[PDB]
């Protein structure tokens with residue numbers, strides 16, 4: 140089998156970038172990204188893409204209108220396509236499909252998503268594959284062009300392996316055969332689920348150590364360095380923070396917990412639950428340190444769940460902000476890429492009285508008792524801190540929840556700041 | 565400044581012995597004296613049969629022994645003679661035999677604030693206290709010591725502290741690059757070692773938890789672990805599902821971490837790390853249950869072969885070995901065990917399982933003697949010899965139906981051969 144036309148149902152953070160790179164690497168393949176949201180689809184064909192992703196616009200504009208298309212005409216793209224990506228929806232596929240088509244699930248949860256889709260297709264010639272994304276937001280384009288591995292799951296039948304290899308053929312345009320893993324549908328789903336849980340666990344583990352460091356007068360970045368030098372552990376994903384965010388980590392871990400309880404594995408359920416427990420603890424612990432240090436205007440720098448994205452889903456900034464609002468604080472929030480109205484939505488009255496969304500970081504710190512850094516945006520370490528201290532109410536506090544002001548502690552102290560940082564007394 | 569010319573090590577064990585042998589080997593100008601109250605052990609060090617099995621140790625020991633490496637029971641003399649004293653109540657004996665400037669260095673991971681307690685004694689009576697935890701793993705101790713990922717040295721941030729720290733750095737710099745040596749304060753060094761072992765143990769419990777999920781859902785844990793391991797942010801090491809981790813350090817370190825957290829009023833951090841131990845104990849009970857269940861829910865007076873008693877391969881160490889627990893779980897159900905391990909001494913196995921041992925336990929000289937007339941064979945240690953055994957011969961003299969319980973994934977790739985021979989193979993992380 141040969142794939143010549145690809146439809147993707149979902150023009151989001153996964154759907155959008157993935158297809159843009161596919162169209163970019165496979166000029167012979169016509170890629171049509173479709174969405175019910177016309178506002179989003181228009182923004183894709185606009186010069187201002189609906190999502191911020193470094194290098195995406197360049198990639199999109201390279202192949203757009205040539206082999207990459209963004210449309211709201213869903214039924215047509217489904218009918219036209221040889222492979223349908225999914226980033227109840229299986230029903231709309233059936234109504235507009237004839238003959239042989241490959242239906243591929245990219246989303247991590249629900250856990251047995253591909254198994255449920257295949258269930259519908261039998262209740263009515265479609266092939267169901269599992270192909271989870273491994274890209275992280277902020278580095279999506281770089282991850283998609285050179286991934287650590289590609290994971291494709293399909294039935295161990297002649298028709299299943301035929302569809303699997305048809306999808307492998309697409310990736311082999313730019314991904315080495317050595318990096319592509321093929322397996323059954325479930326092993327692929329379980330593998331993605333477990334991988335994200337291992338990743339989230341690393342953060343909770345180093346965050347738990349950061350609490351131990353604050354309590355004992357050690358430095359978590361010093362400890363993390365020593366831990367990271369063991370090649371059996373590795374040096375990546377050991378950066379202590381206010382807490383992990385994103386649409387996937389907490390959702391995946393919780394879905395893992397539910398599967399375990401569904402399978403009568405309560406110890407495995409309690410084992411992975413601790414990853415979430417520790418994360419929520421780290422957040423409460425950080426907010427408490429802020430309230431406690433302030434015996435009031437507060438500047439919140441960074442609202443995205445990580446840098447280089449406008450995504451705010453499950454961002455620790457949301458929780459820290461809400462924890463302070465519940466104590467009656469007046470917040471001034473700045474984020475370089477997060478849209479104003481998204482911040483308002485996230486915090487909902489209470490928002491009307493307490494929350495102000497600033498256009499620039501200096502506007503936010505103007506007349507603030509304290510500045511709280513929740514997202515590791517690079518611009519934050521290059522700000523004029525003498526200028527900020529100037530227009531700040533005194534005593535002026537800095538709460539660094541991302542360790543971005545490291546190396547500036549001497550400068551900031553002599554300026555007149557009282558700096559509080561995660562994982563350090 | 566300062567130069568170290570004589571080193572005494574109080575402790576001739578798995579850490580003390582190999583460490584000093586490599587130091588003497590790399591620093592011919594330094595006289596290294598390993599001392600112990602146990603004369604039997606000290607004699608064994610000067611004997612052609614070293615008291616511990618460690619690949620390449622005898623070659624290293626015999627290279628520098630009697631030249632700059634010495635094993636003695638004369639503790640007080642070696643302490644008095646030494647510029648640096650290694651420790652692998654003992655600070656009292658150091659004081660009684662020390663004068664002037666000496667550096668006292670703690671190598672043991674727990675008690676958590678060991679170096680802080682030693683320093684406390686020295687002030688209650690010119691000694692410098694350092695922290696220098698080992699990072700070697702047993703079985704690969706010599707290879708780890710000659711090329712470690714990093715060396716960690718902790719000392720006081722005082723002029724005298726940094727002078728002692730750099731004096732110890734000077735020793736390692738004979739064969740360890742400056743780029744791999746980390747210097748910090750005493751506590752940050754102690755905490756770093758404690759946390760590192762906890763991260764390592766956690767990786768095993770995490771992959772073991774997934775192995776349970778695989779058995780329940782018909783996935784393969786080695787397939788899953790491969791996919792996880794290809795992410796460079798996670799890494800591919802320490803992702804081997806097993807019956808459970810053992811060793812003197814992992815459970816002890818994690819439990820000591822839990823106690824420190826509760827002592828510091830951090831109960832959530834305590835419960836977070838406790839799960840690493842909970843999962844490990846679970847994996848063990850789960851494996852033993854799978855054995856009892858596969859044998860018609862009764863193993864009383866049924867002969868069972870236990871292959872491997874060491875907590876890992878290439879060592880004779882049995883401390884906290886999962887083999888101990890699986891063995892005891894089966895003995896409690898009345899099974900007759902035949903235990904074989906290539907390097908674990910017979911009497912150590914007997915001690916570990918204590919009557920009950922007299923009636924149920926037999927220690928075999930070779931693996932075929934153990935499987936002779938057994939209903940089931942249980943592989944608990946990943947010894948390389950186990951994958952190269954004559955399995956047609958074993959099936960021959962085995963009571964039938966013959967079961968194989970592979971708790972280390974060492975019989976992978978042999979499943980086809982073993983099934984056609986007539987075995988029913990049960991393996992961890994696979995339905």
Ligand SMILES: O=c1ccn([C@@H]2O[C@H](COP(=O)(O)OP(=O)(O)O[C@H]3O[C@H](CO)[C@@H](O)[C@H](O)[C@H]3O)[C@@H](O)[C@H]2O)c(=O)[nH]1
Pocket residue numbers: 247272273274275276335338342375376377378379380382383384385386387388444445446
């Ligand atoms: O050392 C670290 C690394 C990350 N984080 C935080 O953890 C969260 C997750 O970040 P990241 O994993 O980089 O972003 P995601 O886009 O959520 O990526 C994850 O989720 C994706 C969608 O499922 C997967 O494809 C990726 O493999 C997986 O890394 C973010 O809030 C980070 O700030 C830390 O606190 N410390």
Ligand SMILES: O=c1ccn([C@@H]2O[C@H](COP(=O)(O)OP(=O)(O)O[C@H]3O[C@H](CO)[C@@H](O)[C@H](O)[C@H]3O)[C@@H](O)[C@H]2O)c(=O)[nH]1
Pocket residue numbers: 673698699700701702703761764768801802803804805806808809810811812813814875876877
């Ligand atoms: O992927 C793996 C790796 C190890 N293990 C088991 O975990 C236990 C620990 O083994 P290992 O860590 O290899 O041996 P140790 O001699 O206990 O070494 C540990 O303990 C030492 C003393 O603190 C440290 O210096 C080392 O860095 C640390 O690895 C053993 O039972 C292994 O079989 C697994 O089950 N799966």
